[PDB]
Amino acid sequence: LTKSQINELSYLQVKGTGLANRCAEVVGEDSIKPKPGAKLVDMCIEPKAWAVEEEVGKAGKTEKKFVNSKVMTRQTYTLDAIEGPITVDGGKITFSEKEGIDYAATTVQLPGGERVPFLFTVKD
Amino acid sequence: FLLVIKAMYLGGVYDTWAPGGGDVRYITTPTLNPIVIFGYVFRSPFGGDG
Amino acid sequence: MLTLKILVYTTVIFFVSLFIFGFLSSDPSRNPNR
Amino acid sequence: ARFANGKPQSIEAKYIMRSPAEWDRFMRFMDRYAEANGLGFSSXXXXXXX
Amino acid sequence: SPRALPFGSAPATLDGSLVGDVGFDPIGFSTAPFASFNNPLYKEGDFMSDLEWLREAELTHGRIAQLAVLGFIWPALFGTFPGNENFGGADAFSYVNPLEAITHVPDLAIYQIVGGMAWVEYQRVIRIKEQGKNRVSGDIGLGYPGGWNPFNLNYSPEEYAEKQLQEIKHCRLAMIGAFGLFFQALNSGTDIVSQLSPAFAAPDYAAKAGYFLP
Amino acid sequence: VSLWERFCAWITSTENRLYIGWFGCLMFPTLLTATSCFIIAFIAAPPVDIDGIREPVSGSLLYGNNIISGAVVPSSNAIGMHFYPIWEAASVDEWLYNGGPYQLIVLHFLLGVSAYMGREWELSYRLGMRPWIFVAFSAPVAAASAVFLVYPIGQGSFSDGMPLGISGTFNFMLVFQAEHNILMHPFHMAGVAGVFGGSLFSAMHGSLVTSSLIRETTENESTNYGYKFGQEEETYNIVAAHGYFGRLIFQYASFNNSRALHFFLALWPVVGIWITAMGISTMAFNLNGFNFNQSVVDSQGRVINTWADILNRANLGIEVMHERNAHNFPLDL
Numbered sequence: 001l002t003k004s005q006i007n008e009l010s011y012l013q014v015k016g017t018g019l020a021n022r023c024a025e026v027v028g029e030d031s032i033k034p035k036p037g038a039k040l041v042d043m044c045i046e047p048k049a050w051a052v053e054e055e056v057g058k059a060g061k062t063e064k065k066f067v068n069s070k071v072m073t074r075q076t077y078t079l080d081a082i083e084g085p086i087t088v089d090g091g092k093i094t095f096s097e098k099e100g101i102d103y104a105a106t107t108v109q110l111p112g113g114e115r116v117p118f119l120f121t122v123k124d
Numbered sequence: 125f126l127l128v129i130k131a132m133y134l135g136g137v138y139d140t141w142a143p144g145g146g147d148v149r150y151i152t153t154p155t156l157n158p159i160v161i162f163g164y165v166f167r168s169p170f171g172g173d174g
Numbered sequence: 175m176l177t178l179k180i181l182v183y184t185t186v187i188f189f190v191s192l193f194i195f196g197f198l199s200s201d202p203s204r205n206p207n208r
Numbered sequence: 209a210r211f212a213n214g215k216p217q218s219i220e221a222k223y224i225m226r227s228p229a230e231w232d233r234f235m236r237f238m239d240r241y242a243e244a245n246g247l248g249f250s251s252x253x254x255x256x257x258x
Numbered sequence: 259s260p261r262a263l264p265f266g267s268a269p270a271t272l273d274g275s276l277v278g279d280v281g282f283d284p285i286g287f288s289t290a291p292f293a294s295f296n297n298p299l300y301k302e303g304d305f306m307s308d309l310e311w312l313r314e315a316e317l318t319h320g321r322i323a324q325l326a327v328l329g330f331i332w333p334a335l336f337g338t339f340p341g342n343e344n345f346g347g348a349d350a351f352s353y354v355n356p357l358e359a360i361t362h363v364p365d366l367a368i369y370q371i372v373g374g375m376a377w378v379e380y381q382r383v384i385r386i387k388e389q390g391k392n393r394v395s396g397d398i399g400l401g402y403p404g405g406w407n408p409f410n411l412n413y414s415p416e417e418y419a420e421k422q423l424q425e426i427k428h429c430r431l432a433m434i435g436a437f438g439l440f441f442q443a444l445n446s447g448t449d450i451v452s453q454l455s456p457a458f459a460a461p462d463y464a465a466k467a468g469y470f471l472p
Numbered sequence: 473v474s475l476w477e478r479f480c481a482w483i484t485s486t487e488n489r490l491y492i493g494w495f496g497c498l499m500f501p502t503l504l505t506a507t508s509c510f511i512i513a514f515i516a517a518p519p520v521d522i523d524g525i526r527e528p529v530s531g532s533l534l535y536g537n538n539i540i541s542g543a544v545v546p547s548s549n550a551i552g553m554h555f556y557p558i559w560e561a562a563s564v565d566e567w568l569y570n571g572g573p574y575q576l577i578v579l580h581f582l583l584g585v586s587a588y589m590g591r592e593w594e595l596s597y598r599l600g601m602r603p604w605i606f607v608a609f610s611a612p613v614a615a616a617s618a619v620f621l622v623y624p625i626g627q628g629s630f631s632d633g634m635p636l637g638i639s640g641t642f643n644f645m646l647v648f649q650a651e652h653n654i655l656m657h658p659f660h661m662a663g664v665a666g667v668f669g670g671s672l673f674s675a676m677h678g679s680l681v682t683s684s685l686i687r688e689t690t691e692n693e694s695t696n697y698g699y700k701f702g703q704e705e706e707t708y709n710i711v712a713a714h715g716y717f718g719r720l721i722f723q724y725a726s727f728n729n730s731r732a733l734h735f736f737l738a739l740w741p742v743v744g745i746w747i748t749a750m751g752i753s754t755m756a757f758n759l760n761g762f763n764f765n766q767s768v769v770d771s772q773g774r775v776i777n778t779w780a781d782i783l784n785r786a787n788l789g790i791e792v793m794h795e796r797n798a799h800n801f802p803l804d805l
């Protein structure tokens with residue numbers, strides 16, 4: 001659901017539901033054409049699938065492949081409220097992150113019982 | 125009943141969640157929906173439920 | 175995992191009802207003296 | 209989890225299936241106890257009459 | 259008097275005069291003459307019993323109020339106002355609030371049912387004016403053991419006793435219930451479906467959204 | 473003869489090798505699932521994060537533990553007091569990562585011991601005896617409930633419950649001392665008195681009874697063989713034992729109504745354990761023991777240490793070290 005719909009819901013109606021991690025959708029494809037000096041007030045990065053580089057043999061040959069993996073931490077992974085200044089050097093948009101909740105501790109478990117913790121971050 | 129009457133028409137009771145801070149107010153519109161009232165009685169006693 | 179919840183909810187209500195209706199079946203009469 | 213919840217039924221299936229166990233017990237209990245209205249023993253925890 | 263358990267009833271209230279004879283008569287207006295009050299078609303003959311006349315009064319009121327109950331629910335729930343009028347949505351199905359339904363409906367159908375109950379009471383008086391002895395609520399032929407209409411009443415005298423009990427009780431309780439529903443709707447401007455269905459629901463203010471969980 | 477009747481009868485039968493009863497219908501499945509899960513988890517449970525800081529702790533035998541170091545680690549601090557059954561996790565692996573088996577085992581164990589009390593009473597009723605053994609068994613049940621359920625309720629997290637293991641038990645006791653001062657609480661004193669007195673009275677009663685045993689055996693045969701099951705006379709002489717006890721301490725001071733003696737035997741440890749469980753329960757809501765810190769002051773004002781201040785020193789030493797990475801702010805609230 002979009003941000004205009006979540007803002008209608010009160011905090012009591014949301015607690016526990018698990019939609020605090022979800023990212024609001026956007027409808028109505030259009031062009032913004034940002035004015036120089038503007039910036040992104042909010043930014044949510046939600047991972048939908050995780051994979052770890054591993055070695056596995058298909059038909060007697062092993063190669064670097066990214067194997068899927070289920071997340072052990074419950075509902076922590078999503079980042080939100082990232083802010084950064086958009087600029088235009090040669091007519092190119094540059095995000096340049098500046099501040100906001102951008103790290104998130106996350107642990108994921110590979111096939112075979114291997115646990116791989118990592119810091120899902122967007123910094124600098 | 126006497127407690128309800130005191131809270132509704134006999135000067136009211138102290139309410140922390142009152143706008144502008146905690147103060148004595150009259151509870152004009154109590155919730156009478158059986159579902160919301162018995163949701164407390166029939167909910168879990170564990171964390172997050174109470 | 176909804177199936178597992180269904181099976182456990184059965185087992186629990188199964189045994190709890192067994193208890194409740196076993197103690198309702200004239201238990202005080204069950205006793206050495208009559 | 210912490211979603212309040214009447215009892216803890218979240219899916220109509222869960223309620224409709226926690227149903228037949230209790231009703232099965234009610235039926236087996238009714239099998240012995242049926243057509244009982246009177247027979248007041250009037251004694252301290254006697255219930256001698258079946 | 260077991261109804262009014264720690265109290266005495268009329269010096270001559272009966273226990274077998276009417277089925278509903280538990281003794282409940284605190285002011286017990288039964289004592290009073292209860293005659294052709296303001297010339298209520300005075301007869302001075304059989305004249306039933308003054309108590310039995312009050313009994314016929316309670317019977318008429320409770321029967322009408324019993325029908326009134328169903329006429330306060332079925333317009334909403336049962337048949338959802340099958341007004342199915344050829345035209346004119348107002349004065350038809352649309353007004354599901356019973357008070358507003360009366361507010362709309364033209365005097366055509368009002369005079370229809372008025373003349374209906376008018377012929378009803380005309381036949382009732384035609385019986386009772388002659389039906390002395392046991393006026394028996396001006397029974398006449400109306401579903402009597404002779405059953406003046408279809409499925410002519412086919413029951414037993416003990417079943418008849420129980421049936422008299424059924425009718426009398428239901429009429430009294432419905433006399434309560436009609437008051438109930440009427441004061442309800444007037445003091446809520448709605449129909450019984452409205453308050454009862456939001457009651458058996460969960461308020462929109464709190465729903466814990468939905469299980470949008472992963 | 474109906475089916476229900478027949479059943480009810482078999483259930484409440486007193487001729488079954490083990491009494492089932494109606495409380496057994498709750499005791500048996502619950503205790504059986506608790507012990508099955510415990511046995512499996514003690515052998516092959518993966519590590520669990522207990523303080524919720526993504527630092528899992530191993531407690532299984534197959535993860536480099538022994539019998540003493542192994543334990544069933546309590547649930548994660550992130551969960552807190554929330555209910556965490558299997559079906560609320562997205563995967564069984566995740567359920568194991570957050571210490572769900574601890575919650576499962578502890579809840580089932582508590583229900584099982586309550587049903588065990590009920591079953592004790594039920595058999596007492598069936599056999600036509602006086603129904604108060606389960607009252608005596610209430611004391612260990614109360615202690616287990618206080619240590620496993622009431623303390624997590626007061627503290628606000630299941631991670632604060634006693635881990636199911638040896639070294640985990642010692643860790644729980646030490647942290648309890650550091651954060652609560654259990655030793656200086658009068659209820660713990662009452663419990664230590666009750667346990668020491670229970671041991672004392674058990675040893676003394678056994679010695680007095682066995683010492684005065686009627687000679688009905690040779691020397692090349694166990695003294696215990698003199699007694700025969702289902703006797704009609706006392707195999708021991710109360711008169712001699714009471715004479716010895718009275719001469720040992722004092723004449724007035726002595727029990728004669730053996731019934732009063734056995735009632736006192738039952739009363740002492742039971743009330744001690746009840747008072748101790750109440751100490752734990754009261755201290756779960758932060759009503760700690762006496763704090764006689766810097767109570768003695770000389771004329772000038774300087775502080776003179778007592779034996780309590782060294783206890784405070786040891787408590788500080790334990791406190792600044794427990795859960796080293798969990799804290800971010802000066803106070804432990």
Ligand code: CLA
Nearest residue numbers: 585612613615616645646648649654663664667748749752
């Ligand atoms: C000489 C020194 C001394 C002594 C005598 C004690 C004595 C005691 N301490 Mg202790 N303590 C001490 C020093 C001492 N302490 C120090 C120095 C510290 C600080 C580190 C502490 C910190 C401390 C804490 C933090 C706690 C104690 C507790 C206790 C009590 C133990 C309760 C108990 O075991 O019964 C209770 C019995 C049970 C819990 C057993 C229940 C059994 C269940 C019902 C059934 C189990 C069945 C089993 C699983 C299977 C059956 C076997 C089958 C297979 C055959 C007891 C009074 C505990 C207490 O307060 O009591 C609750 C407690 O929590 N002490």
Ligand SMILES: CC(=O)O[C@H]1CC(C)(C)C(=C=C/C(C)=C/C=C/C(C)=C/C=C/C=C(C)/C=C/C=C(\C)C(=O)C[C@@]23O[C@]2(C)C[C@@H](O)CC3(C)C)[C@](C)(O)C1
Nearest residue numbers: 324325327328400401407408428429431432435438439442
């Ligand atoms: C040939 C012939 O014609 O003879 C006829 C004879 C005769 C007798 C007519 C026949 C019959 C039998 C008949 C007609 C029987 C009819 C009986 C009838 C119609 C009896 C209604 C009772 C209603 C009551 C008691 C009140 C209920 C409701 C009450 C008291 C409430 O509590 C309402 C409540 O609403 C409020 C107040 C508020 C809400 O918040 C809560 C609720 C909803 C709970 C036959 C077979 O047709 C034949």
Ligand SMILES: CC1=C(C#C/C(C)=C/C=C/C(C)=C/C=C/C=C(C)/C=C/C=C(C)/C=C/[C@@]23O[C@]2(C)C[C@@H](O)CC3(C)C)C(C)(C)C[C@H](O)C1
Nearest residue numbers: 283284285286287323326329356357359360433434436437
């Ligand atoms: C059909 C329909 C409609 C209708 C209608 C109508 C007309 C409904 C009418 C209902 C009606 C006419 C309801 C009467 C109740 C009388 C009562 C309750 C009397 C109680 C009296 C009591 C309880 C007293 C008991 C006593 O003990 C006391 C207290 C003192 C004692 O000494 C004496 C007695 C024993 C007496 C609309 C609205 C027109 C359109 C709508 O669409 C549907």
Ligand code: OEX
Nearest residue numbers: 627631632647651795804
């Ligand atoms: O978890 Mn077990 O020990 Ca009760 O205090 Mn806070 O938390 Mn943690 O620290 Mn201190």
Ligand SMILES: [Fe+2]
Nearest residue numbers: 677681730734
């Ligand atoms: Fe002994």
